[PDB]
Structures are given as structure tokens and as C-alpha cells.
Design a protein around this ligand. Sequence first.
Ligand SMILES: [Fe+3]
Ligand SMILES: [Fe+3]
Ligand SMILES: [Fe+3]
Ligand SMILES: [Fe+3]
Ligand SMILES: [Fe+3]
Ligand SMILES: [Fe+3]
Ligand SMILES: [Fe+3]
Ligand SMILES: [Fe+3]
Ligand SMILES: [Fe+3]
Ligand SMILES: [Fe+3]
Ligand SMILES: [Fe+3]
Ligand SMILES: [Fe+3]
Ligand SMILES: [Fe+3]
Ligand SMILES: [Fe+3]
Ligand SMILES: [Fe+3]
Ligand SMILES: [Fe+3]
Ligand SMILES: [Fe+3]
Ligand SMILES: [Fe+3]
Ligand SMILES: [Fe+3]
Ligand SMILES: [Fe+3]
Ligand SMILES: [Fe+3]
Ligand SMILES: [Fe+3]
Ligand SMILES: [Fe+3]
Ligand SMILES: [Fe+3]
Ligand SMILES: [Fe+3]
Ligand SMILES: [Fe+3]
Ligand SMILES: [Fe+3]
Ligand SMILES: [Fe+3]
Ligand SMILES: [Fe+3]
Ligand SMILES: [Fe+3]
Ligand SMILES: [Fe+3]
Ligand SMILES: [Fe+3]
Ligand SMILES: [Fe+3]
Ligand SMILES: [Fe+3]
Ligand SMILES: [Fe+3]
Ligand SMILES: [Fe+3]
Ligand code: NA
Ligand code: NA
Ligand code: NA
Ligand code: NA
Lengths: 154, 154, 154, 154, 154, 154, 154, 154, 154, 154, 154, 154
Amino acid sequence: MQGHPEVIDYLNTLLTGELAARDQYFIHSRMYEDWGFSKLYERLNHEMEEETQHADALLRRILLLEGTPRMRPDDIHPGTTVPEMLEADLKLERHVRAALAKGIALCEQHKDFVSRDILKAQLADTEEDHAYWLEQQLGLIARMGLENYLQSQI
Amino acid sequence: MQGHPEVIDYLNTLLTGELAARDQYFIHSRMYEDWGFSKLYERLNHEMEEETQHADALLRRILLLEGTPRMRPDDIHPGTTVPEMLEADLKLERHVRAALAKGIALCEQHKDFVSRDILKAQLADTEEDHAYWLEQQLGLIARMGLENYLQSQI
Amino acid sequence: MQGHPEVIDYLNTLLTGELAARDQYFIHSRMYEDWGFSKLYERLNHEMEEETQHADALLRRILLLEGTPRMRPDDIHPGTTVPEMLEADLKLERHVRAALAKGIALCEQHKDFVSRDILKAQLADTEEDHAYWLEQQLGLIARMGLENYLQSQI
Amino acid sequence: MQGHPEVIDYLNTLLTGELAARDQYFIHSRMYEDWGFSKLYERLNHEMEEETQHADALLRRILLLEGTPRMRPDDIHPGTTVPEMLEADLKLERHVRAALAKGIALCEQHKDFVSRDILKAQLADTEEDHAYWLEQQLGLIARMGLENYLQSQI
Amino acid sequence: MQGHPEVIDYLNTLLTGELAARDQYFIHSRMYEDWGFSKLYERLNHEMEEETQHADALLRRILLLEGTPRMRPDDIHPGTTVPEMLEADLKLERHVRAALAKGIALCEQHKDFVSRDILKAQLADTEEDHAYWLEQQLGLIARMGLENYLQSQI
Amino acid sequence: MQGHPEVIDYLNTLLTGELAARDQYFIHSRMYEDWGFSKLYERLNHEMEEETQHADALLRRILLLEGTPRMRPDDIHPGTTVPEMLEADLKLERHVRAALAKGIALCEQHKDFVSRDILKAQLADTEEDHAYWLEQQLGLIARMGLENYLQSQI
Amino acid sequence: MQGHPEVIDYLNTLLTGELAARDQYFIHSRMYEDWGFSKLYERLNHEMEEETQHADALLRRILLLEGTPRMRPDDIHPGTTVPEMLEADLKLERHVRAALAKGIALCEQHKDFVSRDILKAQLADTEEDHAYWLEQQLGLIARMGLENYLQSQI
Amino acid sequence: MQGHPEVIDYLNTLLTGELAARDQYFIHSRMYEDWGFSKLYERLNHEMEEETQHADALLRRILLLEGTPRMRPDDIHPGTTVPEMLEADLKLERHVRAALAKGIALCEQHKDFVSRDILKAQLADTEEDHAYWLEQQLGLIARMGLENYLQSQI
Amino acid sequence: MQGHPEVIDYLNTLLTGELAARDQYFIHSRMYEDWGFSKLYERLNHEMEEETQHADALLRRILLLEGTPRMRPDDIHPGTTVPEMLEADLKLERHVRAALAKGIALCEQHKDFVSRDILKAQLADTEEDHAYWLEQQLGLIARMGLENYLQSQI
Amino acid sequence: MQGHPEVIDYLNTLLTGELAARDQYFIHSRMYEDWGFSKLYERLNHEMEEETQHADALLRRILLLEGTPRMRPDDIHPGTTVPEMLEADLKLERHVRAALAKGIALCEQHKDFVSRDILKAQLADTEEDHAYWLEQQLGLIARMGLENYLQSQI
Amino acid sequence: MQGHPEVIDYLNTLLTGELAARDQYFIHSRMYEDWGFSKLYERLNHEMEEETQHADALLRRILLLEGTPRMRPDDIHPGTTVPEMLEADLKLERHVRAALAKGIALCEQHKDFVSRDILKAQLADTEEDHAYWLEQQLGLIARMGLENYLQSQI
Amino acid sequence: MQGHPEVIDYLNTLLTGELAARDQYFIHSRMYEDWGFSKLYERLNHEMEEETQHADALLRRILLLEGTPRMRPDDIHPGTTVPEMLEADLKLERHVRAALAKGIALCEQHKDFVSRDILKAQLADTEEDHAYWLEQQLGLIARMGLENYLQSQI
Ligand SMILES: [Fe+3]
Ligand SMILES: [Fe+3]
Ligand SMILES: [Fe+3]
Ligand SMILES: [Fe+3]
Ligand SMILES: [Fe+3]
Ligand SMILES: [Fe+3]
Ligand SMILES: [Fe+3]
Ligand SMILES: [Fe+3]
Ligand SMILES: [Fe+3]
Ligand SMILES: [Fe+3]
Ligand SMILES: [Fe+3]
Ligand SMILES: [Fe+3]
Ligand SMILES: [Fe+3]
Ligand SMILES: [Fe+3]
Ligand SMILES: [Fe+3]
Ligand SMILES: [Fe+3]
Ligand SMILES: [Fe+3]
Ligand SMILES: [Fe+3]
Ligand SMILES: [Fe+3]
Ligand SMILES: [Fe+3]
Ligand SMILES: [Fe+3]
Ligand SMILES: [Fe+3]
Ligand SMILES: [Fe+3]
Ligand SMILES: [Fe+3]
Ligand SMILES: [Fe+3]
Ligand SMILES: [Fe+3]
Ligand SMILES: [Fe+3]
Ligand SMILES: [Fe+3]
Ligand SMILES: [Fe+3]
Ligand SMILES: [Fe+3]
Ligand SMILES: [Fe+3]
Ligand SMILES: [Fe+3]
Ligand SMILES: [Fe+3]
Ligand SMILES: [Fe+3]
Ligand SMILES: [Fe+3]
Ligand SMILES: [Fe+3]
Ligand code: NA
Ligand code: NA
Ligand code: NA
Ligand code: NA
């Protein structure tokens, strides 16, 4: 079934954003593991699997709409310390959030309600789970200090 | 069976106090969750269920005595930081404790011994579990400092 | 993540409406129990738990959006007979329904699609379960008469 | 295997009658549910599944006989109250009964004994279960009055 | 251990009251069974077992206090119709309630706190279960009429 | 609860479309079975059950909104060969898709968000499962030829 | 119990027809096995068991009616290729079908309704299972070609 | 549903025949038991249960057809020795067989095909099980002599 | 929470009494074991565990009230023969009983109802179990003589 | 532990090759699914998971050696038909094979035997499983033709 | 089978290194236990078992090659504080790593590929598990400070 | 994938060596069985299965490399007594060992690292299991004498 070219193009923009989120969590989770923070490894490894599923949903929708998926991830920007990595991932999730919300409005304007619903499901994941967890960690650092926080993530 | 109007009125005063305790623990438990302190969320969520049961016992007793329950909670006074919230809940429990003890004496004076027993059961919960746990947390903060304490409640 | 002040304020308006629905079902379910209608007690006790979950969803969303939840329930208006209580609860659910629908439109206008989805989930509960059950009971009373209906709810 | 054209045509007449019986029970069962009569919903939902199987048997037999099935249901005539719906379904079953009996005689005259047996199986269902249950409900209404009857079907 | 003679004598007064409550429920439960009201038989049979336990607690306490139990039940006053029997049992429970409350005050004045606690346990049973159930049945009769109520107790 | 007449009327238009989809899959699944293609029978039998559920959702929503459901299916247009039947079902699903999308926009304009959500759930089924499967079969025929495809569906 | 001589004689005619059907399926199933078509072996082996049961029913009925069974099978006419064998079995089943239908009419004319019912059970097997399966295979060959069909029966 | 008076009357004639068959097997089975032939007791006790089911089917059909069942059994004619009882039961079953066959023809002439099918089911039981077993026992007596036969039935 | 100094002091007086009861049962139970009376060892070992729990309840309550527990047991007065030990333990329990009852009155006068309830629970244990068992043993000795009694406690 | 810069750089070259292999299998597996070839979807989905593990091994080794992983995948070159995609994946695996073999020689020359072993494990996967499977599919197409091959992968 | 004398001698050099690693972990694990760090005891106890297996592999290989194992461990150099012990073990593992890598090159030059493989297996253990874990602990100390780190190892 | 001709040729040389080892163990194991040495039969039967797997690995690798396997086993040289057979098998394993080691060096020189790894796995089996077991048996004979050794292998 042929989708609207503007919707297909924008789904492709989101797809390359999700492939990048997957890859940023791939490097960050392994960096956390390398430093001995098993709880941060486990959380970010789990998020990497979740972004792979987000990407998969977009990729499959683009194919169903007879589009050609764009498979190059956006460039990523890993941190070099725990606070920088948490900040970098939060910036990433805020960008995804804004990009999804623009896509939701676009899908409504092109009367593609199934694509809109796919994006809204990911927006809820982005706001209520991914970004929220990151905000919580930065807030825990602010309240107990970085050293106590890092001890809790061994 | 028609209860004594003074006892019914005082049970209503206690009921609105218990509905408020339930609601203060509702907001505090969710604030703790929002900040990433799962152990404080779990404890205060559990206390919210316990105050709902305390309220239920009073509400049912008022109806059995052919009274009309007052269902508006007392106003609550949530804190804005972990130490303020613990303090606010302790002040709340101390007020409940005093209110229950006055009610126990009142029920005895009106020879309503079943109502008295209902209140004494809640007084033991208030003193030996609710208030006691809060005193313990504030004492833990005093002994290990706030930052170490907050780390323990993740 | 900072939500739009108008959306946060309106979520707070809905929250105090849900806290009230919880409390109206608390008093009504216990009144039904007091009169020996176990089936009405069980149904309204279950709805009280459902409104507590509705309130919880709004409260958590307000906190996630960096708002301060308003915890005072709206005033409630319990009935004094079975038909009055059913009517009062239906009036309550119709008001909730209208309030949610206005909030859904508001969330769309502020491009807060996750908040909109939270409200739409509650709107479906309100229309297809809560209000619907109440309409059914009043219709059963109309068809078999009040006395036969009350016998069926022992 | 090529069936007799008169038998195929008459099986088609019965098929559109069975598709209609299925659809009348579809609307009636959901109307009963909408009014809170779960026992009438369950019974008529079950009959809707039984008429779907009756239709299926006729449809498959028509295809086996190298006929082309007629898939438009006959028009249906739903009631607007419980007594009218029971009456309308009984009128429907009486019509089906007569139509099946004519078909049984026709199949014998064309020496199509397998088609005859298919119809006789449905005739027994129609007389001994479908129509019989409806006669029983109308008789229960006559003996205990409509209001007591409707109470029994909640 | 020698109890206070006034307390022992009053426990004996209560014991003969409990033996009577047991016997009134014995005759009423069997009358209900004789008329075909299995639910009233089961409830009053259960209450007869509960009053036997109440009597047993008093009898054992009197012996422990080196008193001689009085074993003649008070005279009972069975009804002749369902409404009269419910009324007669409610009058019985109201009398027990008042007698227990006087005994509680007496035990306190003689500093016999264990006897007081035994009586308070029975007072809660009397008010919150025995008398309450009877009030509920009479209220159900008032709301749905006697005939519908009796049908519900088959 | 009284729905908007334009929304009720349009839900009725969709209902007769879903009843037709159910019936087209009823005849097609049995035709496939008659020819020995058990895999096509099983798939289309399953879709017939899915369209019955789609119809049921619309029918129930119309009743809840105090409308009168229209129960006559739209006319159907069965094929006479496997490729024609697949094509006819795809044309059917494309029509359903367009009709649902118009209804979604209509429900939004009348601020009936629960009806809108019911339609969006069916739109996702229509696009991502029903129509998609049919497109896949026609594409398999194009890639391996009809004869090899039909062999795979025995 | 002495049956009618014309009915006994005709049952014997059918018995020798069923013994032949058993034997034609015996040779065909083993020929299919010899060529490597396990699915055709399994199907025709199963039909051979079914014809043995058909023969058994006739043989037992003839004995019950005090007749002497004729045990020589009719001559059979096996094919030499898969299409010829399917055709030969279909011709066989069409002959059985016609012979059974004549016997059904004969049994009715001699008021032997139990014999008639035995024949009608076999007629349904013959039309709806045995002949139908063979028609389906020939139709599959027509639709996908012989080579693809034979591959599917390995 | 009102049956044809001639069919109802004839079903009543059959019903009194089946009630008699039940009663003849009641006395015969107990006579066999009294003499120590447990195998004949068990067989005839089982047949008595089967005739009770035959009677039940006729009785229920007569009521469904709005007839009044005739409940007096036909007179029975028990034997006084094992060979006489077997003979008497065979004569009974032959009479039932003939009566059922006449009823089958009558039901067809009045186009009551469900009643006809009820009778045909009983006719098969009568011919293939009840009468057949009795013929077998008499034949066993003829082949091994009465004394050896009776030994086998201990 | 700061308790009343007079209540704390009196709880301390009771605590040292309970620590002594524990220790008197420790020596007596082991003396009984040393002489071969396993049943007296088991009973007094069990009472020693019960007094340890009584002491624990008082100790914990004193700490909760911000008092400093007094941990020196009162002096104990073990017997030298079975009758002397039973007598010594009964004297001990009578003293505990009186001390608890005075404490109950004191707690009421200082409106410390939770402390009062703790004491009343122990008073019931003291009267109805500990002292009662001892009275029973001395009474058994009086009724069967010491030698028969001691034989029963091996 | 600081690795040799030339080895770290070459591991990074391999890592971006493995991230690309993962992504080419991501798009190809979903394209196969979109066309209805479930067996090709399952195989390539499984290979995508295997390349993710290959990438993970390299990424972790680079971090252990105190290098900074390069996370941008190499560009990929998806096909547009089944034969092109198989060819494109085989070209990809041949390139990986050659790149790994060069890396193995490099690791030996820098006496990094653990890195060498990591690469040799992946080389065996590449040659004996990934590339081999692709060669097999192309060979199956050559032997049975593309259409028969594609039928086998439904 | 006679091994090369230079390879046997070098395996002996490695064996005495592994016996020493076992013994250094023996003393360190017990020192950690003595200080109350159960997690460091468990880890180093596990490494002591792993070095015993490394030694065993070398010892067995030397015997298989008809060499005489050297069983004196190299001298060890335990630390006196947690940071010194971690450092001392890391220095030990770095020395083992270098010694193994030299042995791998030596085995290749003498074409003893099985001995080489034994050493490479231990080299991977040394680099990727033993040394890596130690680097991680020192890095955790650097990031959260020694005191927080030691608390985490209780 | 086309392997290097020199590597393929040498793998073929090894393959015919492994086929011979399989066959020498086939004859030796059966000779041991024939003489009553079940333990030698079981061991050499197991080695025959192991050499079949070694051959299989080489054969499959040669095919993967697009070579043509040479399937003639090398000539074998069975012994005629237990000591001769053990010696002959040890000579065989020493030859295999040397042949594998030459092949390992050859594979490295042609940069075929997967083939090298296949050979190294077999070299470890040859040295550490096959040859080692044989050396052990000859050494056991030297230490306890042949007669005692043979007794141990019954
Ligand atoms: Fe998750
Ligand atoms: Fe995402
Ligand atoms: Fe995300
Ligand atoms: Fe608790
Ligand atoms: Fe409370
Ligand atoms: Fe509280
Ligand atoms: Fe619910
Ligand atoms: Fe709500
Ligand atoms: Fe609600
Ligand atoms: Fe049924
Ligand atoms: Fe039907
Ligand atoms: Fe019907
Ligand atoms: Fe009870
Ligand atoms: Fe009582
Ligand atoms: Fe009572
Ligand atoms: Fe599905
Ligand atoms: Fe649909
Ligand atoms: Fe559809
Ligand atoms: Fe079959
Ligand atoms: Fe047959
Ligand atoms: Fe047949
Ligand atoms: Fe039977
Ligand atoms: Fe019968
Ligand atoms: Fe019979
Ligand atoms: Fe005890
Ligand atoms: Fe005590
Ligand atoms: Fe005590
Ligand atoms: Fe794999
Ligand atoms: Fe790879
Ligand atoms: Fe690969
Ligand atoms: Fe390990
Ligand atoms: Fe080591
Ligand atoms: Fe090590
Ligand atoms: Fe082995
Ligand atoms: Fe080998
Ligand atoms: Fe070998
Ligand atoms: Na700390
Ligand atoms: Na009634
Ligand atoms: Na083909
Ligand atoms: Na004999």
C-alpha cells in the first residue's frame, strides 16, 4: 500500500534516529561494564534492545508503505565519564521526543493514523521510561553526590 | 443501632484525619518514586494502604452506629525534600496519635467499648509502626548523614 | 521534563475529580454493604480501586512534568437511597467524561500527546465501563422495578 | 459432483435464512447485554454460533454440489423489548422449521438423501432446542410475570 | 485463683444469657429449615455455634476464678413468623449488648482486666456481627418487601 | 449516553461494511477448502472470526451510544479463481481502510475520542494484518508463479 | 429376524461392491507407496480401512436378517498412473453412490428403515469424504499441474 | 408447538409400549437375580434402563408437541422359566419393532420428520441390540442345550 | 516518642520481673530434666521461652518510649523438690499477676493505652495459661498423690 | 591494559564492518518478511543477532585494551530482489572474511594472541556458517530454479 | 611422547608462576575474609581455584611430554592494605600475561601447537578475567573513593 | 569458496590417514572383543567413532573449499597380539600427530586459519587422548606384566 512520500521520508528520519539511539546505548552499556558498573550495563543493555525494537517498528512500517528504509544511523556523541554519558543520553532522548512529536502532528495532517499510533507508542516509551530514568539518575547524583551514586551501581 | 452523637461526631473527626493520612502518603510515595527512591515509594505506598484500612474501619463503624460519614480529608502538608517529607509525616502521625488517645478516653466515658477498641488498634499501629518507622529514618539520617541514607533507599 | 503550565493545571483539575470519584465510591460501597447489598458493595469497591488507579496515573504524570499535584478531592454528593446513589454516581461519571474530553482536546492543542493518551484511556474506562454499568442498573430498575432489582443485589 | 438445480436453489434459500437467524441473534444478544441481562446475552450468543454452524453446513453442501452459494442474509426483524425480541425469534424459528420441512420433502423427491439428512439434523436443532427454549421463556413470563422473569436473567 | 464474688456472680448472669442465645438460635434455625429457608437455617445454625463458644468462654472463666457456673439458660421467646423471629433475635442481641457493657464496667471497677477483655471480645461479636446481620435483614425486608426477601433465603 | 447522530450513522455504515467483510471471508474460506487449499481455508476462516469481532465492537458501541444498529451486510463480490478472490479481498480491505480513516477524522471533529480509538484499532488490523497478508500472497504469486504458489497452500 | 428377500439380495449386491472398494484401495495405496508418495499411501490405506468397515456393517446386517452374505468382491479396475488411479477411484465412488441411493429407495419401499439408515450413513461417507477427496485431488492437478501436485504428495 | 393429533396419539401408543417393556425387564431381571443368574440380571437390568430412556424420549417429545402423555404401561406377560422369559421378551421386542415401523411411516405421512427420527433411533436399538441379544440366547440354548447355557449365566 | 517517666519506670519494674520469671523457669526446667521428668522439662522450657517474649515486649516498648531498660533480673527463689518448685512458680506468677494489674491501672491513668494493652496481653497469659497450669498440677497431686503424679511426668 | 595502537585501530575497522553486517541483515530480514518469505526472515534475523554478538566481542576487546570504539557502521548495499540480496550478503561475508584474515596476521605480528583468537572464532563463523549458507542458497537456486527455491522459503 | 627440552623447561617456569598465583590468592582471600570483606574473599577464593586449574593443566602437560615438573612456587609479594593487595595481584597478573605470551611464541617456534593452545587459553583467562577484574576494582576506587568501595565489598 | 590447492591436497592426505585410523580401530576393537577383552573393545570402538568424526571434519572442510575428497583409506597394519596391536596403534597415532603438525604449519603459511584450527583440535585429541591412552597401556604392561594387564581388560 503506497504511503504518503512526506510521511515515508519522515519515518526514515526517525528510523536513523532510533538506529543511533540503539548504538549510543550499545557503546555506553559496554563502557559502564568495562568500569565495573553492572547495574548501568544492565539498564543500558536493556534500552539498546528497546531502541532496536523501536527501529524495527519504523523499518517495518516504511516497508509496508512501499518506502525504502534509510539504514545509516545518525551520528552519536558518547560521553567520557558517567555524568557525561547520562547527560548525553538525556540530550538524545529529548531530541527523539521532539522528533516523534513533530512526526505525530505530520501523520495526522496526512491522515496516516496507524503511523501516528506507532509514533505515539514510542513517544510514551521515550518520555515515561527512557528519558525519565535518566532524569532520575542525574537527580540521584544531585541528592547523594556522585561517589555514593556510583557505589550504588556496582 | 444508634450510637452516641458525641462519639459519632468524634469518629468523623478521626475519619477525616485518616483520609488525609492516606492522601499525604499517596503524594509522598509517588514523589519518592519520581526521584528514584524505590524503597521509600514501597514503604509509603504500603502505609497509604494501611491508612485506607484505618479510614475504612472508622467509616464502617460510623455507618453501623447510624451516623453519616464525613468524607472530606483534612488538609495535608507535603514536604519538598526527603527530610521535610519524613518530618511532615511524623508530625502527621503525632497528631493522629493524640487525636486517637482523646477518642479512646471519650469512648470510655460514653461506655462505647467496641469503638474504643477500634481506636486502640489504630493507636498501636500509629505508635509502634507508622510513627516508629519515621523516627527510625530521621535517626538513621542523623547517624550516617543524609547522602548515605538516601543511597540506601534507591 | 517541564510540561506546559496549562496542561499541568488541567491535569490537576482532573486529579482532584478522580480523587473525589474514589471517595464517592468509598462511601457508597460501604453504605451498600451496611444495607446488605453485597453485590453493590463488591462492584463499587472495585470501582473505588479503579478510580485510585486513575488518580495515580494523573498524579504520576503531573510529577513527571515537574508540576505540583493538587491533592484535595472535589466535593462529593452521596445519595441516601439506592436509586439516588446510582443517579449521583452517573452524574459524577458524566462530569468526569466531559472533563476528560475537554482535556484531550487541550493536550492536542499543546502537542502533549502522551498526556492525551493517558486521558483517552481513562475516557474509555469512564464511558464503556463505569458510566455504562450505572446506566444498566437504572435500566434494570426501570424494567423489573426497584424491589426485584434490590433482591438481585443481596 | 453436480447436484440437482432445484435442490441447490432450495439449499440457497435455506442458507440465506440461516445467515439471517445468525444476524438476528447477533443483534438481540448484544441488546440483551446492553440492558444488563447477561443470561440472555449468553444464550443468544450461543445460538448465534449455532446458526453460523447451520449456515456453514448448507454453504459447504452447496459448494460440494457445484452450486454457487447465495450469501445475502434474509432481512431480519429485531424487537425493541424483551418480550418482542423473544416473540420475533420464535417467529423466526417457526419459519425456519417450516422451510426445513419443505426442503426435506424436496430432497427426498430428488433422491438427494445426504442433503435431506443435513436438513433433518438442523430441523431437530430448530424444534427441540432453539424454538423450544424460546417457548419456555415466554411461558415463564406468563407464569411468574415479566418483572420476575427479567430479574432471573441478570 | 479466687475471683471477686461480684464479678463471678455477674459472669454467671451473662453465662445464662449466652446459653439462652444458643437455644433461641437452635429453635429458630430449625424452624427456618422446616419452612425451606436454607440460607436462614445456615446462618442461625452458625450463630448457635458462636453463642456456644461465647458461653464456653464464660463458663471456663468462672471455673478458673473458682466459681460455680449457673447452667440454666434464661427463658427464650421464639417468634412464629420470619419477621417475628428476626425481631426476637434482635431484641435478644440488644439485651446481650447492654448486659455485656454493664459487665465491662463492673470488671474494670474490680480491676479484673482479663474478664473485661473476654466480655469486650463478645461485645464486638454481638454488635458488629450478630445484631448487625439481623438489622440488615429487617432493612432488606423494608426495602424489597417480605415476599422478595423470603425468596432470596431459600 | 446519547452519541452524536452523525457519528452513530457513520458507525452504522462501518458496521454494514464489517458484516460484509465477515461474509466475503465466509464464502472465500469455504471455497478454498472445497478446492483443497487447507492453508487458505485456515487463514480466511481466521479473518472471518476477526471481522466478526470488528463488527461486534461497532455494534456494541452503537448500542452504548443509544443508536439502532443496521444489520444488513453490504453486498459482497466473491471471486471465481484464487487470484480473483485474493484481489477481491484486497479491494475490500482497501475500501474498509479508507472508510475507517474517514470515520476517524469524523469522530475527532465531533469530539468522540472513544469511538475514534475503536476505529483506529481496526484500521491497524486492516492495514498491518488483513490487507498486508493479501498483498503478500499476490506478491508471492508474482515471484514464484501461480502454480507453485497454489502448491504451497495445500 | 427374517428380512425381505429383495432387501437382503440388494444388501449383498452392495457388500460385494464394498469388498471391491476395499481391494481397489488396497492395491492403489500400495502402488502409491511403491512410487514414494507417502501421503497418497496414507490416505488410501485409511480409505481401505473405511471400506472394510462399510463392508462389515453390510455383512453384519445381512446375517442379522438371516441372509447368507456374498463374499466375492466385484471386479476392480486399477489405474497405471497417478491420474488414472484417482480417476478410477472416483468412478468407483460414483458407482457406489448411485448403488447406495437405489438401495435407500428400495429399503424405504420395503419398510426396512434400519437398513435404510445403514445405507444413508455410508452414502454420506461416500459423497462428503471419499468422492470429495478424489475430486479435490483432480482439481488440484488441474490448478497447479501434475508435477507440482505429485511433489506435494511425497 | 402443536403437533398433529394423529402423531401425538400414536406416540402415546408407543410410550405405553415402552413403559411396559421397562416393567417386563424390571420383573424378569429380578427373577433372574432371585435364581442366581447374575449375568441375566445384569443384562436385563441394563435393558430396563434403556427402555426407560426410550420412554423418556417419547414422553418428552409428546410434551414438546403440546400433547398429554399416557402413563399407564401396556400389560406385560412375564415367563415362569428362563426359556419362557427369553421367548416372552423376544415377542415383546418383535411387537415394539412392528409398532415403531408403523409409526415411522405415519410420521413421514404427516411430515413430522423429527418424530420419525426419534422412532428410527429406537427401531435400530430394538432390532440390532434388544431383539438380537434375545435371538442369540435362544440360539445358544439350541446349540449347547439349556443346562450348559444356564451354567454360563451364573 | 517520649513516654511518661512513671510509666517507663513501672515498665522497667515489670521487665526485671519477667527476666526473673524466664530465669526461674530456666533453672526449674533443667532440674526437672536432671531428675528424669521430661514432661515437666518440656513445659517449663516452653514457659521460659514465653517469659523471654514477655520480657522482649516490655524491653522494646521501653526503648520506643525513649527509656533506658533495666536488665538485671529480680532475685529468684527456686524450690528443691517438685512440690516446692511448683509452689515457687505459682507464687511467682501470682506476684507477676498483681504487678501487671497495678501497671494496667497506672497506664490508664497516664493515658498510655498501647502500654496498657501490652500489659493486658501478658496478664491473660499469666492468669489463663501460666498460673492456671501450675494450679492444675498442684491439684492433680492433691487428687492422685505425689507419687502417681510424678510417674505421669516421666 | 594498553593495547598496541595498530591492533586497536584495526579492531575498530573490523567493528565498523560488523556493525554494518548487522544492519544489512536487519534490512534484508525485514524485506524478506515483507514479501512473505518467513524462512529467509528467520535465518537473516538470526544472523543479525550473530553479527551483533561479533560486534560486541570486538567492542568489548577494544575497551579492555583502553581504545575508543568507532561506532559508525560501514555503508551497506542492500539488494532489491532475492537473488541480489543473497549475492550482496555473500559479497559482504567475503569482505569480512578477508578483513578478519588480515587482522589475524596483524595480531600475530604484534604478539596479541587473545585478539587473534577472537578474530579466528569470528572467521570460522564467517566461513563455515554465514558465507556457507549463502553459497548453499545460490546453489539451490541454480539447481531447482528461482521460482521453486522461493516457494521453499515461504 | 618426548617434548622439546626448551618447551618443557619453559612450561616449568610457567608452572611455578601459576603455583605462586594460587598461593598469593590463598593468602589475599583469607586476609580479606579476616577483615570482613566477604565479597573480596569470595572473588579471590574463586581465583585461587582457577590458578590451581591453570597449574594443573601445565603440570599434566609437562608429565605427558615426559618432563619432570618443578613444584616450588615462585616467591609471592602480598600487600598489607586493600589497595596494595589489588595492586600486587595486578602486577602478578601482568607478569603472568607477559610470561604466557613469550611461551606462546616459543611453542610456535618449536612446532608444539598443543602446548601453545594450552597457554593461549590461560592468556585469555589472565587478560579478560583476572587482570581485568583487578583493573576494574582499582578504577572503582578512583571513581567513588576507597571508603565507599570497601563498604561495597562487605 | 575456493581453497588453496596445496591446502586442499594436504587436507586430502590427512583425510585418507583418518579413514585408515578409523579402520584400524574397527579391526582391532573387534579382535579384542573376539578374545574376550570387553574393556579394550569398548575403548577402541569409541576411538573408531572419534576417528570417524575426525575424518568427517576434514571431508566437510574439503567440500566447503570446493575440493574433491579422496576417500580411499591409507593401508593399515593390524597387530596379531595385544602388545603388537597397542604398538601398531601408537605408531599410527605418532604418524597422525606428525602429519597434523606439518598441516598446521602449511595452513598458516597459506593464511587458512580456519583449516589450521580444525587440525589443531584434532592434534590435541591425538596427543592428549589417543596416543596418551596407548602409552599408558604399554606402561601398565611394563609395570604389572602382560598377564595381569590382560586380566584387568576382561
Ligand atoms: Fe523496559
Ligand atoms: Fe526510541
Ligand atoms: Fe529512547
Ligand atoms: Fe505494615
Ligand atoms: Fe491511621
Ligand atoms: Fe498512620
Ligand atoms: Fe473493572
Ligand atoms: Fe476515573
Ligand atoms: Fe469513573
Ligand atoms: Fe446449544
Ligand atoms: Fe438454524
Ligand atoms: Fe435456529
Ligand atoms: Fe461468624
Ligand atoms: Fe453471645
Ligand atoms: Fe449474640
Ligand atoms: Fe490474526
Ligand atoms: Fe474489519
Ligand atoms: Fe479486514
Ligand atoms: Fe476418514
Ligand atoms: Fe463404502
Ligand atoms: Fe467409498
Ligand atoms: Fe446397551
Ligand atoms: Fe424400546
Ligand atoms: Fe426394547
Ligand atoms: Fe504456650
Ligand atoms: Fe510473663
Ligand atoms: Fe508467667
Ligand atoms: Fe547460528
Ligand atoms: Fe561477523
Ligand atoms: Fe557474518
Ligand atoms: Fe571465574
Ligand atoms: Fe593463571
Ligand atoms: Fe591469573
Ligand atoms: Fe573420548
Ligand atoms: Fe584422528
Ligand atoms: Fe587418533
Ligand atoms: Na558514602
Ligand atoms: Na418478585
Ligand atoms: Na514447481
Ligand atoms: Na456340561
